[PDB]
Design a protein around this ligand. Structure first.
Ligand SMILES: N#Cc1ccc(Cl)cc1N
Ligand SMILES: N#Cc1ccc(Cl)cc1N
Ligand SMILES: N#Cc1ccc(Cl)cc1N
Ligand SMILES: N#Cc1ccc(Cl)cc1N
Ligand SMILES: N#Cc1ccc(Cl)cc1N
Ligand SMILES: N#Cc1ccc(Cl)cc1N
Lengths: 157, 157, 155, 155, 157, 157
């Protein structure tokens, strides 16, 4: 039994995230999406809302489950008997910062990190830029799962 | 069930490569090291020598095997019933170049690529730089497995 | 009838920015400098506009306007669909690439990047303000008028 | 009377290149694609020119010409002083920045960079040829005509 | 005769910083570690604590001394009759940012900056990441000098 | 007595190189410029021509001397009782490749490397691009020392 954790705030989940989830679920026996709860910055969607949106979008992935997490990521990973993290990367700058984090996580807890390159179509989408664009009436419907877009239009009204 | 291919020319394999092999073998049920040969340019080591040096330094990894090939990596991967490549990266520059090859490989064959960050200790070792330094007499004994170092010095002498 | 928009906060405009404006004005019939209203900086929007107008008096095909909201709406409402932005580093390119691709996706607005003049590789509004605040001489990095205005805000 | 030159070896032209040509043609009155003569590639200069002309038939303000020597001389001899070049990565920007600054220094010719369309992030003439040589399907990455021509060179 | 200044906030000093100090002290007749304080934002450690932690881990470097300051680094450097800054770098991203500050510092005051590449083992340690990991209970004992680690845990508790 | 080696092919020396030489000579008691002899690629100027051009350009630097070298750079450095290299850097990409080399040189011989950021004015000049531009009649006189430019015009006729 192999497995990996896919961490993020997912506020909201985007099609770029979903592409990573699908690719991880195709290669590991189990995948856990870890939705981070951050006591400091409370974003647009509640943790439960974020989990619901991810579950809707990943309904066809039976070996993927969604859970909330808090604190040190490598504790979350090890408490679930795993020792791999899977994350998506878009740029070389992304890789430099994430490499530091990955080496740190491997040093402190023996947890490894596997990165996957973004699908070309989603190279420019992020949760933050999608929210910003949508806030001013830009159309981000092609960048988000169908249900997320509906939920996002409600938060904006 | 799960599996990945670790590709390279491995001319010769380094401790950086071995670290990647070990980490892939810890996370996938089977790992194949693909020694990719250019039929139009001989390297320093013959295919048999490259394979022998890898086998001698991976004897403790029961789910790893070593095979050579040429042509498209994605054909090597698919003909073994697999759909994943695992590659080590050191730098952001590495990532931008490998991203392009990864996206091409996914485009033409649906094969995914997972990258892993180098161990810090091997951030500066490459087959090419180790060969160049050794050619001019520098001490590279700590960067190569025992199965490689003196065979390398032999080739140079 | 070609045209492009040069966006920024310009707080204050530097010689790096001016170089980009001049180069955009040399290649497009119409240039609009778009000054962001983002409501915490040093100069008011009006002051920023004035400083740019002062420094671009020799560019007959350039005008300066403020705006809020999506840049692509600013651009499209003026009948244009190009943005001209200056870049210093590869890091800059990676971040601006994402914005550029988003802007093209949502509004069909293209982005043209121009490399910084070598002499202004290290110049930014932020660093100029910081250095001047602690007494450093930035007079060679800012339009003559801007510099005097900056001294006034600090004293 | 605005204008820009789009330079390259184009061996062969890809959909990435074509995207850049279309975007240059939308923003400048005149575009010249400059095909480098560099005397070792797959297609002759004439074949490369033909392939680009075939693929740009819907761009009335674009023409295709070959050239040798300094790009800035090609540009200036045609009365222009802008180059439009597509970029994929930050690494690309760092290398092209140096060329751009050199070209501005020696000839006053400016360079405008445009970000790759997302769909063509991984497309290059070199990689397309390599993949096709070993049997990979690159038909979605090249103009329809180019693709058939490529099959012909390999078979 | 020759000399350089090694600047930073050192909140706290790490083994990466100490490596830079040692390498600067090996190549310049005198080295001054400049602990730069923001009078408007307190860090984790007071100035006296930062200086004490550096002194305790540099006692074997006879030509190094530690002083605090604020405002323009180039003024700190020139008022000591020096004209060189020595700074460690980990990444290409680091280099682009530090290049801009170095060129500004040379412009306004004629002060030069020499960069040195991180030791591989410390490629992933930073004061900020060590503090964040420790805040959530991760083991950072191997990344910080003895003069720092338990004082850090004390601050957090 | 402190010191450093400034290595390169210098074919020909440019104003960017000279700026690095000046800055090194200002901070180290002695500087040796090492002009590399490469048996494979014989460039535009002979080693003796390259040395002569550098000596002309550095006439005002009494603590800098110019010598040819061959083979492993760290041997050249240590044979002269030194253990520091000084090199100029223009970009983040430069730093990534040079960092590998610097870590390798420190690993194999204990020789350190100090990098300096290019002067802004010379960010785009290199020996290779200057030669290429000049070959086709471009004016590179503002990028090269006065004497080099004269010598370059002769090699081109
Ligand atoms: N949002 C988002 C996102 C996350 C991961 C990757 Cl690889 C691509 C993306 N656009
Ligand atoms: N050689 C080599 C090598 C290969 C992969 C990684 Cl991650 C690190 C390395 N030094
Ligand atoms: N400020 C500023 C600035 C803006 C654009 C460019 Cl290309 C260079 C700069 N120094
Ligand atoms: N080939 C090619 C190509 C050229 C320019 C751009 Cl921006 C993208 C590409 N794929
Ligand atoms: N912290 C820290 C640090 C500082 C400088 C260098 Cl080169 C490496 C580091 N890890
Ligand atoms: N040529 C050359 C050169 C060498 C070093 C530096 Cl820092 C800048 C340059 N232009």
């Amino acid at each position: 039994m192999t497995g990996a954790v896919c961490p993020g705030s997912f506020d909201p989940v985007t099609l770029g995230h979903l592409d990573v989830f699908e690719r991880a679920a195709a290669q590991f026996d189990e995948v856990i999406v870890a939705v981070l709860i951050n006591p400091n910055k409370a974003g647009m969607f509640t943790v439960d809302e974020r989990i619901e949106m991810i579950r809707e979008s990943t309904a066809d992935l039976p070996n993927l489950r969604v859970e909330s997490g808090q604190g040190l990521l490598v504790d979350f990973v090890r408490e679930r008997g795993l020792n791999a993290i899977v994350k998506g990367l878009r740029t070389g700058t992304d890789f430099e910062y994430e490499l530091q984090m990955a080496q740190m996580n491997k040093h402190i807890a023996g947890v490894d990190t596997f990165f996957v390159a973004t699908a070309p179509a989603y190279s420019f989408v992020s949760s933050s830029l999608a929210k910003e664009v949508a806030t001013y009436g830009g159309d981000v419907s092609a960048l988000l799962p169908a249900s997320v877009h509906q939920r996002l239009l409600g938060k904006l009204r």
